[PDB]
């Protein structure tokens, strides 16, 4: 798809946006690609993960949610609308985008359109509130109202599909068609007004069911099972791990670039025994003022070497001025970039690009000449 290597190499607009974002990559790209003449594909061959991260920083989007449920007032009342909320309103509800297309560029501007929508009956209907005739609504948005009702039947036209027999409730009701028993009373039937027609709460029940169905079905895009469902997982056998087991041999080769008999061993040990039993005079450890001087001299030379090495170890301060230090830093940066490209093309080892490696080699020679 769009995340493949060649797509990231060929996406010039994404690379342009990444350069507009980054700051040190300005200096690197300016002093390598602009001046020394690297191919852009060569420069972006080693920075595929950075391009992919910048792509995934903006290409991903939030999941659908009830955006009109979040919009609540706070005499003056204020509501805040983010552009992400506007996009969620457009995605979750096609009727609002339909009104936006033929109302905003034509007659009245965007905030007037949103105020008219929030003061309309359509906002009360899509939120799930009971529609009342005493409310004025808005005379511009309400012409879309029946059209939105059209959308609802088209919603049924994309939602009414046959289901499995595990949860088939239409087969539950129609298990026998000749049920003519006691009619369910008014507690088990939808509520009606004084004239006998429905009060309209079944309308908002169907509306919230339709909204949930639309949210679930929006996930299904490009972005025998009944036996598996009815089987009890506990009564089956537990999972046995199939992890591999290794055994390590310690028959390694010895590192490559005097025999003593037991009688010399034993007589040396006996000499140690008689030297230990008689008098273990500790004062003999004191040196004779010459080997002590030699040992002290060796230790002072070693610690002088170690102190000279470890006297000094954010970059450290230097005697170089800022301009010449920065020139040396950019020359080192472009030389290292050339070296990295040369080595990755050299050890990649395709003959067809091998001559291109020669070009880098010439640039490497120029790098030497540059120094």
């Amino acid at each position: 798809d769009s995340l493949s290597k060649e797509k990231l190499l060929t996406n010039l607009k994404l690379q342009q946006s990444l350069l507009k974002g980054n700051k040190v990559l300005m200096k690197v790209f300016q002093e390598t690609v602009i001046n020394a003449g690297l191919p852009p594909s060569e420069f972006w061959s080693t920075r595929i993960p950075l391009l992919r991260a910048f792509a995934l920083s903006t290409s991903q989007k939030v999941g659908p949610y009830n955006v009109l449920s979040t919009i609540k007032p706070v005499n003056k009342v204020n509501v805040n609308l983010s552009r992400e909320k506007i996009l969620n309103i457009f995605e979750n509800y096609p009727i609002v985008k339909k009104a936006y297309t033929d109302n905003v560029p034509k007659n009245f501007k965007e905030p007037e359109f949103w105020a008219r929508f929030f003061s309309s009956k359509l906002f009360r209907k899509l939120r799930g509130e009971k529609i009342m005739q005493n409310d004025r609504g808005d005379v511009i948005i309400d012409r879309y109202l029946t059209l939105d009702q059209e959308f609802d039947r088209k919603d049924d036209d994309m939602l009414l599909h046959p289901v499995k027999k595990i949860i088939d409730l239409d087969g539950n009701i129609q298990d026998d068609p000749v049920v003519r028993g006691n009619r369910p009373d008014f507690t088990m039937q939808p509520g009606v007004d004084i004239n006998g027609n429905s009060d309209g709460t079944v309308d908002i029940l169907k509306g919230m069911n339709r909204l949930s169905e639309k949210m679930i079905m929006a996930l299904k895009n490009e972005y025998n099972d009944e036996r598996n469902e009815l089987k009890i997982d506990d009564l089956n056998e537990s999972y046995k791990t199939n992890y591999a087991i290794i055994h390590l041999k310690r028959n390694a080769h010895e590192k490559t670039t005097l025999k003593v008999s037991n009688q010399q061993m034993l007589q040396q040990l006996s000499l140690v025994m008689d030297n230990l039993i008689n008098k273990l005079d500790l004062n003999q450890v004191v040196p004779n003022n010459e080997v002590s001087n030699k040992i002290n001299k060796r230790v002072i030379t070693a610690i002088k070497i170690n102190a000279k090495q470890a006297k000094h170890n954010l970059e450290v301060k230097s005697t170089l001025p800022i301009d010449l230090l920065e020139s040396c830093r950019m020359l080192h940066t472009t030389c290292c970039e050339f070296l990295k490209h040369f080595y990755i093309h050299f050890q990649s080892g395709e003959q067809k690009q091998a001559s291109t490696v020669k070009k880098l080699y010439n640039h490497l020679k120029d790098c030497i000449e540059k120094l």
Partner: peptide, 21 residues
């Protein structure tokens, strides 16, 4: 200033886009 740098950058991309097309 980075304005001259990005202007030269956009000039280079314009020249490149002229080159492959």
């Amino acid at each position: 200033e980075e304005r001259e740098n990005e202007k030269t950058l956009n000039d280079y991309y314009a020249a490149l886009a002229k080159k492959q097309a």
